[PDB]
Amino acid sequence: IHHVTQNGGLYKRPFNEAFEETPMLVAVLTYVGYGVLTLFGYLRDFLRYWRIEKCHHATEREEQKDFVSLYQDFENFYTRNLYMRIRDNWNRPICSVPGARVDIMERQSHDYNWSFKYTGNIIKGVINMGSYNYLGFARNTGSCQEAAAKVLEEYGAGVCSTRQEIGNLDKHEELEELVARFLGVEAAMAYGMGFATNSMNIPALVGKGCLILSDELNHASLVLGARLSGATIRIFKHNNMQSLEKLLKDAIVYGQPRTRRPWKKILILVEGIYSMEGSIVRLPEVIALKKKYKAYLYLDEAHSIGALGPTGRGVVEYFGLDPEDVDVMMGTFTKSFGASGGYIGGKKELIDYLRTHSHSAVYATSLSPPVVEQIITSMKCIMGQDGTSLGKECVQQLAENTRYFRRRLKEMGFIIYGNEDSPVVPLMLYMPAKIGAFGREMLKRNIGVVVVGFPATPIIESRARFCLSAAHTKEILDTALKEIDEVGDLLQLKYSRHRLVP
Amino acid sequence: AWKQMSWFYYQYLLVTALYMLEPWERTVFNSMLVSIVGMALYTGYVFM
Amino acid sequence: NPATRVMNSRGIWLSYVLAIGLLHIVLLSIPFVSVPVVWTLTNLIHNMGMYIFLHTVKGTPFETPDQGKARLLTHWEQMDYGVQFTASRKFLTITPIVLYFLTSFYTKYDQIHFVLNTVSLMSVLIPKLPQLHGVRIFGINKY
Amino acid sequence: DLTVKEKEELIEEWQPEPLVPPVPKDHPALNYNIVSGPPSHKTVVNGKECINFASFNFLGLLDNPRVKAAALASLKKYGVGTCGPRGFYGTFDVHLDLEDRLAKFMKTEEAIIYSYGFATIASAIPAYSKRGDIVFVDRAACFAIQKGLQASRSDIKLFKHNDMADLERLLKEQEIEDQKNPRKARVTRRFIVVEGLYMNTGTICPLPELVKLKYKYKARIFLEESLSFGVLGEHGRGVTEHYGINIDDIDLISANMENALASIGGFCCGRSFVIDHQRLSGQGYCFSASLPPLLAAAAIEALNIMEENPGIFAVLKEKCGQIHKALQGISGLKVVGESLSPAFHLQLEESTGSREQDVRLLQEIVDQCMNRSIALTQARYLEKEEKCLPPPSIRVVVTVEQTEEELERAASTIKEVAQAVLL
Amino acid sequence: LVEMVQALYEAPAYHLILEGILILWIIRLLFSKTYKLQ
């Protein structure tokens, strides 16, 4: 309707995004601060060899001085010289329900973050922009936290066996039937850990003789599940549909690496939303390529199920596509439902296969009944099933909040990554000493944010990540936008070469 | 005029990543930064 | 591996060409030296630093990517996933050659500075041949 | 090479295999039992009322009314979920409190909790052991240990079950290779991975000799005791207290909070030198949401009861050797396990010769015992994915909530149906 | 720098030969393909 591609991907509405490059002077200035820190790290290592006290940390026993050393000292070099200098903004403990405002325990340090001490005070009312609470279902008073209390009273905290022995209740049977109606598939299956839905079910689908095509920026669970299967792994550029086709065509003409026999099959692992990048997958082009080359698709929508689409169905609904064109769909319940666990949906022969040949079904214990009762209630709320318009209002509110926030920051003058419809907003702040300054200066102003540094991102790509929700009022959101300006002026974070105009 | 002048030292501390070093490390760097420039004018005076 | 893509990042060549240019002004600011000796010191110090950082320190400064498959490889052998004659491996091969044509011209073509600069240039260019990709001369620096 | 016209023919003739294989014939599983209500002492399974001999809660702490009050009081002030991964506003004060209580209970220095019982020992092994290391693993280890070993690309050398002569023969062979290349032997680490009170066999590891071997051949120990924690010892501290061994000799200790604590998750306890490393290196601790606070509030309440009344561990063992003596004598069924183990096996004596015919035979005993109100289960494995697949069996699991009358009536029913199916 | 330029004329034989061999090392290395090792 709107536009097509040479592949044949049909886009109904515009697909517009932006990844502006780092200005040259800022890049040149980042390396100065990354070299000055390294020089001093070497100096401090030398002093700590026989001259500095450094008695605040731990060592090996006296009886095991002649074993081979447990660690390789050069691996935890950045940990003890860089990360440790500004690690007072990464494990902040909270003491209340997390959403839209949280209470943080106040801690202080005297030997430069090597040890901490809780004074006894509490910072109340801190605006929360650090936890995934899309749609705002994380609360301690309402109708979803009302039924969990009933189930807990009669069932108990947790089960004590596996799904295949005696840990198969009727709650599990009641939830797996509802997830399939939500997604629009035939059958589903729920597990109990989002990280273990990938690393314990991918090795049940592929083995030696098969090929895996991974996106550059995949989650750790997706990468571990592939490493455990025994298949060959090949990585393509991020969201590049030319790299994927060039790497997909060259695998059907040349076969396996040494014997040069045809591959048994080919699997493609992508994600719905990339949380550190803020982008959305080009799904209509990935679907129009795996039908032309007969590959299988594996979608991981842990950051979009409930956060995209007119009725909160995810990226498949957001693009107007047919849910049955995807071989496996997997997701979590911990980013939009305020719960725990994960699911896989798809055909009926696939779920039938996985119920018998999955590592989790036979070795790992089942889900907790009070958590299943959370998911069942909030999923019914979203479907408009309860009777109120809470599900519709909360779905729409997040869209306007995202649009307003992302538009204001662009006029203000910052560099923002990603797609215009993405509820994750990464703010660019490149220099290594501004990582430690932004987190410290925002908490002095009652705002909670997360920051990310080098051995998680590229070298000059440090950023701050904002998460929006449907519980953020317009009066909270204005307060946050007003306080971000002051810190952006104070630390000089407005790098954009071409700023927006109202 | 004090506040304004204090702001440039803060920006200098961030651009060079001394905002996150201890006081003694900071003094070790500020000492050899001023000496090199100091002996850079002396060599640009005798040979001029 | 996050450490193989560093030498490709935006502004890394111009930031490196200024690291040698800044060392040549702090060495030439000494009150009691000579111009020929300032240009020999630049060449030797740069080549020794490059030798240590590219051909002696092996492993990463952070947690090894996958169970430590690069715990025995110097930074030169990890670079660009082992692929030879990339732009980043050609810049670092040509730079010590260009910096030799200047320290030959500014020393007036002396005979004793030759036996120093030539020894240093050979020391920095021998390890970069594709034929030595992993060879440890007489066992030294292997574990 | 390969003009652009015949490439389409190659691309066009290719034909992949289906994503899942078509089912060949009738399978064993694919018939989950459907329990209505909670799996408590008296359970309803498949519409019938029966006594539970199949669940792994040895202390009867699941439906303890006191444990649920502490879980509701934590549900009433936190909600149900933690909306993040423990390094981004995901740590609560409940998590730190539970970590301190565990460390104080084990008389250890530090502790770390995971949000999933399987991912505890599957993430801890590959965080210490790397590409060029030797690991000596017992032959009857569980599946989580095998997956953790597979994820750490190290050299696995697996020895017989519970014999120190084979472990010593394996270590002495490694010493001969240390004298052939002394430069490489000084950068190579050696780990011994053992499991107090094995689950696949029902036996108990000999620890005092394994400690002596540690200091003689210089190899660290990794104890994995998720079935002796809160069962063995005179305080429920595991096997180290059973043998009277100093706990500073066992390097790392692991367990899960799912059997005797009747909750969710696992934990590792050790010295601060080794436990501090997993907080930045464990895969399942760094890239997963942390444990729901109402589940961490149940473990603290269970751990309070475990310390208040220490005579509950003597009760569990007194009636553990009761059903292990009331079963000896069945014809066609043999007992595999120790007199001190609350979860042992009944394996089939002299199997026909076809596994599929033994899994089909034991199910007759299970299905016909369950009609006499005695619920049993069968051990499940992933046949094609196991190093040393055990024989088919029937788990018999003892708890403190089973009275002596029920225990002595279970043996009669098991013997009655087994001497009439195996005849 | 009058002295420096007038000294390249009187440069030894074996040196200007080493600077000609080194200029051919660059040209041959500035025209290669790529070839990941097998």
Numbering used by the authors:
A (entry chain B): 45 to 546
B (entry chain C): 9 to 56
C (entry chain D): 11 to 153
D (entry chain A): 51 to 473
E (entry chain E): 10 to 47
What sentences appear in the manuscript?
The ORM/ORMDL family proteins function as regulatory subunits of the serine palmitoyltransferase (SPT) complex, which is the initiating and rate-limiting enzyme in sphingolipid biosynthesis. In humans, the heterotrimeric SPT core enzymatic complex, composed of SPTLC1, SPTLC2 or SPTLC3, and SPTssa or SPTssb, catalyzes the first and rate-limiting step of de novo sphingolipid biosynthesis by condensation of serine and palmitoyl-CoA to generate 3-keto-dihydrosphingosine (3-KDS). As a critical mechanism for the homeostatic regulation of sphingolipid production, SPT activity is inhibited in response to elevated cellular sphingolipid levels in an ORM/ORMDL-dependent manner. In this work, we demonstrate that ceramide binds directly with and inhibits the human SPT-ORMDL complexes, a process that is important for establishing cellular sphingolipid homeostasis.
To elucidate the molecular defects of the ceramide binding mutant, we then determined the structure of the SPT-ORMDL3 variant containing ORMDL3-N13A mutation at an overall resolution of 2.9 Å for the monomeric complex. Structural comparison of this ceramide binding mutant with WT SPT-ORMDL3 reveals little conformational variations, except for two evident local structural differences. Firstly, the ceramide-like density basically disappeared in the ORMDL3-N13A mutant, corroborating the largely disrupted ceramide binding by this point mutation. Consistent with this, the purified ORMDL3-N13A mutant demonstrated a decrease in ceramide enrichment of approximately 30% compared to the WT complex. Secondly, the N-terminal 10 residues of ORMDL3 became flexible in the ORMDL3-N13A mutant, explaining why this ceramide binding mutant is no longer able to suppress SPT activity efficiently. Several residues that contributed to the intramolecular polar interactions at the ORMDL3 N-terminus in WT SPT-ORMDL3 structure, such as Asn11, Arg15, and Tyr91, exhibited apparent structural shifts in the ORMDL3-N13A mutant. We suggest that ceramide binding might trigger the conformational changes of Asn13 and the adjacent residues in ORMDL3, which could induce and lock the ORMDL3 N-terminus into an inhibitory conformation. Although the SPT-ORMDL3 (ORMDL3-N13A) variant displayed a similar Vmax value to that of the WT SPT complex, the Khalf value of this variant toward palmitoyl-CoA was nearly two times as high as that of the WT SPT complex. This suggests that in the absence of ceramide binding, ORMDL3 can still inhibit SPT by reducing the affinity of SPT for palmitoyl-CoA substrate. The Asn13 in ORMDL is critical for ceramide binding.
